[PDB]
Design a protein around this nucleic acid. Sequence first.
RNA 1: UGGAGAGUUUGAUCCUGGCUCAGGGUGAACGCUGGCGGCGUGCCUAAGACAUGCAAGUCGUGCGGGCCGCGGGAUUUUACUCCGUGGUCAGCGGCGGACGGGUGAGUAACGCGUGGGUGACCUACCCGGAAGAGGGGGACAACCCGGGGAAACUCGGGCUAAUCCCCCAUGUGGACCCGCCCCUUGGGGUGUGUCCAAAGGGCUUUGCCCGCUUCCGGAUGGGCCCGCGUCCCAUCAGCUAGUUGGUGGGGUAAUGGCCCACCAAGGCGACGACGGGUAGCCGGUCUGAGAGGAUGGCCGGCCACAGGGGCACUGAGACACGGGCCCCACUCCUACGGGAGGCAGCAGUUAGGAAUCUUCCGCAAUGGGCGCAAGCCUGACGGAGCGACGCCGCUUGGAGGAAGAAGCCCUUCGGGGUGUAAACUCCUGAACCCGGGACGAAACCCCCGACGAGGGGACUGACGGUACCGGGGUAAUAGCGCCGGCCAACUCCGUGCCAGCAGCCGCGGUAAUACGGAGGGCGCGAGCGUUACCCGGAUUCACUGGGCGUAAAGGGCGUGUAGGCGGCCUGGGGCGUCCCAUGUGA
Lengths: 99, 83, 208, 99, 62
Amino acid sequence: PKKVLTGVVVSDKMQKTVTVLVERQFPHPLYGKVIKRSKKYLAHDPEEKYKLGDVVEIIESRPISKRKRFRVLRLVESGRMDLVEKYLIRRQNYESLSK
Amino acid sequence: MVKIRLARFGSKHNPHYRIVVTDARRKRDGKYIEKIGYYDPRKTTPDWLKVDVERARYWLSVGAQPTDTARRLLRQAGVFRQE
Amino acid sequence: GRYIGPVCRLCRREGVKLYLKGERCYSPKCAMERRPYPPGQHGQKRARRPSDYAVRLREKQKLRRIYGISERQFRNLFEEASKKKGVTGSVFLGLLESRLDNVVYRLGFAVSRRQARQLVRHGHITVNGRRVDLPSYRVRPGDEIAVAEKSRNLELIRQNLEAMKGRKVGPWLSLDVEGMKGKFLRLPDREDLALPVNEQLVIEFYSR
Amino acid sequence: RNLSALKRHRQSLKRRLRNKAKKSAIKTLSKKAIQLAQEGKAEEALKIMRKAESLIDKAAKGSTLHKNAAARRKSRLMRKVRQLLEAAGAPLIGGGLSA
Amino acid sequence: AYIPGEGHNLQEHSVVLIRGGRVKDLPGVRYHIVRGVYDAAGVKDRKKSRSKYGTKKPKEAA
RNA sequence: UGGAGAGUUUGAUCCUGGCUCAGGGUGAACGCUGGCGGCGUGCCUAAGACAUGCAAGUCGUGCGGGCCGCGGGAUUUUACUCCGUGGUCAGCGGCGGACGGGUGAGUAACGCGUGGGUGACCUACCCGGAAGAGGGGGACAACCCGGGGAAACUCGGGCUAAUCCCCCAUGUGGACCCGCCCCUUGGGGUGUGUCCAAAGGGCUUUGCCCGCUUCCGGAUGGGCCCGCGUCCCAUCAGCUAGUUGGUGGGGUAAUGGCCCACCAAGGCGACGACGGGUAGCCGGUCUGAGAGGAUGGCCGGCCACAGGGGCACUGAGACACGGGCCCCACUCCUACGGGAGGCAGCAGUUAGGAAUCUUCCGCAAUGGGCGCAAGCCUGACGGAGCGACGCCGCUUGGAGGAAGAAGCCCUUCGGGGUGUAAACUCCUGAACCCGGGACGAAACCCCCGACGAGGGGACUGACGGUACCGGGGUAAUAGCGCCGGCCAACUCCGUGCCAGCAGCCGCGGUAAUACGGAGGGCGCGAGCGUUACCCGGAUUCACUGGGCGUAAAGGGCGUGUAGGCGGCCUGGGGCGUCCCAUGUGA
Ligand SMILES: NC[C@@H]1O[C@H](O[C@H]2[C@@H](O)[C@H](O[C@@H]3[C@@H](O)[C@H](N)C[C@H](N)[C@H]3O[C@H]3O[C@H](CO)[C@@H](O)[C@H](O)[C@H]3N)O[C@@H]2CO)[C@H](N)[C@@H](O)[C@@H]1O
Ligand SMILES: NC[C@@H]1O[C@H](O[C@H]2[C@@H](O)[C@H](O[C@@H]3[C@@H](O)[C@H](N)C[C@H](N)[C@H]3O[C@H]3O[C@H](CO)[C@@H](O)[C@H](O)[C@H]3N)O[C@@H]2CO)[C@H](N)[C@@H](O)[C@@H]1O
Ligand SMILES: NC[C@@H]1O[C@H](O[C@H]2[C@@H](O)[C@H](O[C@@H]3[C@@H](O)[C@H](N)C[C@H](N)[C@H]3O[C@H]3O[C@H](CO)[C@@H](O)[C@H](O)[C@H]3N)O[C@@H]2CO)[C@H](N)[C@@H](O)[C@@H]1O
Ligand SMILES: [Mg+2]
Ligand SMILES: [Mg+2]
Ligand SMILES: [Mg+2]
Ligand SMILES: [Mg+2]
Ligand SMILES: [Mg+2]
Ligand SMILES: [Mg+2]
Ligand SMILES: [Mg+2]
Ligand SMILES: [Mg+2]
Ligand SMILES: [Mg+2]
Ligand SMILES: [Mg+2]
Ligand SMILES: [Mg+2]
Ligand SMILES: [Mg+2]
Ligand SMILES: [Mg+2]
Ligand SMILES: [Mg+2]
Ligand SMILES: [Mg+2]
Ligand SMILES: [Mg+2]
Ligand SMILES: [Mg+2]
Ligand SMILES: [Mg+2]
Ligand SMILES: [Mg+2]
Ligand SMILES: [Mg+2]
Ligand SMILES: [Mg+2]
Ligand SMILES: [Mg+2]
Ligand SMILES: [Mg+2]
Ligand SMILES: [Mg+2]
Ligand SMILES: [Mg+2]
Ligand SMILES: [Mg+2]
Ligand SMILES: [Mg+2]
Ligand SMILES: [Mg+2]
Ligand SMILES: [Mg+2]
Ligand SMILES: [Mg+2]
Ligand SMILES: [Mg+2]
Ligand SMILES: [Mg+2]
Ligand SMILES: [Mg+2]
Ligand SMILES: [Mg+2]
Ligand SMILES: [Mg+2]
Ligand SMILES: [Mg+2]
Ligand SMILES: [Mg+2]
Ligand SMILES: [Mg+2]
Ligand SMILES: [Mg+2]
Ligand SMILES: [Mg+2]
Ligand SMILES: [Mg+2]
Ligand SMILES: [Mg+2]
Ligand SMILES: [Mg+2]
Ligand SMILES: [Mg+2]
């Protein structure tokens, strides 16, 4: 099975590409507590159809660029700008950790 | 070219082979593809040679040259005996 | 090599009378009937309350010295009994009593385990017809333990097989006295033996 | 100190030489063909193309160009030619292209 | 390094094997010399723990 | 079927708490000691440098020669020349040299593990199935003639064969462009157009054997991609300009910023980017009641490397340990112009080091390359050699044998110990001597049959005159540590805070069970101790399983971001969770 993941488009700045943040969760190997973790995937959108906020599925794919190995299978639901806020703030916090 | 051959197991002054299918290129005692039998040349035990002939037949069916002595053991288990 | 050295001398020390000489360690002396105290200059002086360790040590030295076996071989047997199913105390004794050298002595062919050892070593014994010179050999049940036809004429085998005229043999053994051959019908339960040894202490000794 | 299968070295140089030439031909003729097609060329653009197609399939017979490296080159070539032709007039002398 | 034993034969260019084992009463002494090796001769007249100290079996009643 | 704790802070107590020990382990080393065998195991350091021999070739059934012989002819004039045949040499050509063997330097990486993906691919030899091989032409080494160099080698000229190379034909088929169907990433099909095949050799010679061509399928082996997993430092916090994406090319077997032109402004980071450190990863191994901790040596699997750095050629496959080119360093030759070399293959030498083997035997077996076969090659391998280095097995005797020798040691002077131990008496009979004597080996091959199935036949053993069997036969090695407590084992002398012991507590200052010796005792035993390292104990990094009022530990207090956590009722989804079946876990 070509791996199908699902997450949230958090960038459309590139041409024919969307960035998709994808959550995965699981027990911690020692401490057992279920923990979330995530990862961004660059996904191929040949028709710049998908935009900021969309939940999409993402599918394992024949390579399209360096580090672009996924295509956008389908829209799951639109909207979710809340989740994009989540990401964008987490991102600007970074500048408040320097010297 | 894949081969039915013998792989050496057992021990010093205690030879025990495995009739085995494997790529030619592979070291003699290394990863094989399938064990399809075993052979104890000193017949220490009443059962000193055994061969899954259905499987042997299969591997010959897909072009596997036996060792001359791999095929002597196979012959014996009526691998090529017909009708 | 197995112990080799003074014997009815731990007959002493270990408190109890151990039967390591057979004929004499049996009759107005295992040296023990004359001097029932430890060897050496201090032997007869108020013994000190023994430490839990001392106790457990002693019991295992007792059991081991009885069978004449070495610490390494004794130890491996214990570890083997521990892996195996069932009361690990008896099992060990099961295994210890399955040594050919012992069976031979249990069967009367020798008067001592030590002497039984020599019989087995020097080819005088045969398991299931085929002969066998390994004291450690595991006699399993069913096995016939004969004397070597060639060896029969010997004064020593004669006497011992003749003094087995009257004698009775453990419940796990049988013995055609004339054919100079016995059998190993099954392995002994703890109850079958009357050893002066609480194995619960031995298992305990091998716990730290 | 004289390992006689540095004969293999000798051979390699001769085979090298042979391949090297076969490929140079294919280059210069392909270039020639595409060049002709730039000026919208009757037979001669195809006539050449047609020669070069042969020279390719030929090279692929042996070790030179084996496979579909062959197919690749033919593909790149008789695409390029047909495209550059239809910039300007008809595929005159029908030569090597499916009607 | 500490030179263990009854007495010794070590002088200024001696060449010796070191083994580790602090001495505890002597600060900054974290190793012992091994006796019986290279130019540290083993302890003479030593009947008992002879294999530390490195002195061969004597031969009068043996 | 699995879980032990002790010593040490005080005058004493409880608690905290560190330290230390008892246990298991080893590719070891060092000391004392050392009898046998079987099976394992053996440069941890200098991925230092290397003498010498050996380590990948094979095919005359692809081709033509040279050289040394022998035989028969054309010849009866001895010049020329035809054929056959024995050695031998390379050359052309093929297939192999990409495997097998070595190593762990680098690598924190789709390197490795694990599970997937390839509509993004390749695969020589092998097996199956469909179809072919008809004309014609060319060159280059060998060989011959000349030239340069000291040598390594090299330049020029001339002839020649092939299964070497090329052109035309046939096109079962296949390739490409365009189109059309089906299918959906570049997967099938189909129509014009174009383009692409081939090699011969052997015969116990009209029919077989080895090959050659194109195509489809299988088998094996691989490439690429992806999810997840994979050590330490945050006293490394910001990193990036082929950078991130795009369009069009190039390159590949194939995807891809792999590379290039142009365009856009992007990509990554506290869920730890960037940097530094350290390290081949794994199956496993050691430890542990387990959870966990440590580890990756043997063996198997993958990677990476072949004096250091780059590079491409050939080829199914290499950017190629024993192939090529260039640069660097080191060694050797040199007629000073130039060359030669690469043991991390097997042995072996030297250096370093606490320390790690024979310049052995054999292709008999297994496996591998070429060969129709015979065979040839094979330091892969099978064996043997050496090291108690480890594991297991075995010996140094067995039964009698005194109120109890002597010597040595205690003593309360009566006695006690070593001690059935010895001496001595029977008994057995490791070593050693005599005899027989292996299994491992039935195939390749030859004959019958048909070169298939089946049957018959012959050869073949390094280990080895070994294992094993039979006859004879000698009482025939014991050591090391420990005895204050933890911990099993106590006394006499010597010694006097000395000499010394010492794992921790601590012993020694004239009665020391603690030092040294004696006797005696305890423990293991061809070993026993030591040092070093891992886990254990250590519930002393605490998930299982700990703590923070005074023992170490609550941030000086707030506000609040990310994050973590979330009251009661109903319904939907089924991500976590649970269950069944199945693939995988070599
Ligand atoms: N010559 C002794 C030493 O050899 C060392 O180098 C050794 C290593 O390169 C390699 O030895 C390997 C070793 O790497 C690796 N860990 C495997 C195995 N342990 C050794 O094996 C090597 O030596 C043994 C005999 O000692 C041989 O039997 C073996 O075939 C050989 N490969 O081969 C060399 C020995 O063969 C060092 N160069 C240096 O200290 C010194 O040369
Ligand atoms: N698809 C995921 C996999 O990514 C891996 O690469 C990832 C990991 O290697 C790495 O991330 C992991 C992180 O996921 C995990 N939660 C923490 C871990 N420390 C990180 O690891 C990183 O740091 C460690 C330590 O410095 C290093 O080994 C290395 O630099 C890197 N792996 O960086 C990448 C993203 O996390 C695999 N190498 C690759 O096989 C595969 O692509
Ligand atoms: N140490 C005292 C205080 O602990 C406080 O928090 C802790 C306490 O409130 C409380 O801990 C309790 C303890 O109160 C009370 N004495 C009984 C209980 N054994 C402890 O419980 C804790 O420890 C046990 C294991 O021992 C665990 O199984 C349990 O889950 C855990 N809560 O729960 C917290 C768990 O640590 C504060 N951190 C602070 O006031 C201070 O640290
Ligand atoms: Mg006494
Ligand atoms: Mg060749
Ligand atoms: Mg205090
Ligand atoms: Mg005190
Ligand atoms: Mg404590
Ligand atoms: Mg050996
Ligand atoms: Mg030749
Ligand atoms: Mg290799
Ligand atoms: Mg090897
Ligand atoms: Mg790093
Ligand atoms: Mg395949
Ligand atoms: Mg021709
Ligand atoms: Mg010429
Ligand atoms: Mg050809
Ligand atoms: Mg057709
Ligand atoms: Mg043609
Ligand atoms: Mg492209
Ligand atoms: Mg490294
Ligand atoms: Mg624990
Ligand atoms: Mg690890
Ligand atoms: Mg290199
Ligand atoms: Mg090529
Ligand atoms: Mg390489
Ligand atoms: Mg080499
Ligand atoms: Mg040295
Ligand atoms: Mg061979
Ligand atoms: Mg062979
Ligand atoms: Mg006796
Ligand atoms: Mg006799
Ligand atoms: Mg005590
Ligand atoms: Mg001492
Ligand atoms: Mg005194
Ligand atoms: Mg002491
Ligand atoms: Mg003393
Ligand atoms: Mg032993
Ligand atoms: Mg712990
Ligand atoms: Mg806890
Ligand atoms: Mg605590
Ligand atoms: Mg405090
Ligand atoms: Mg406060
Ligand atoms: Mg608040
Ligand atoms: Mg919040
Ligand atoms: Mg809730
Ligand atoms: Mg679910």
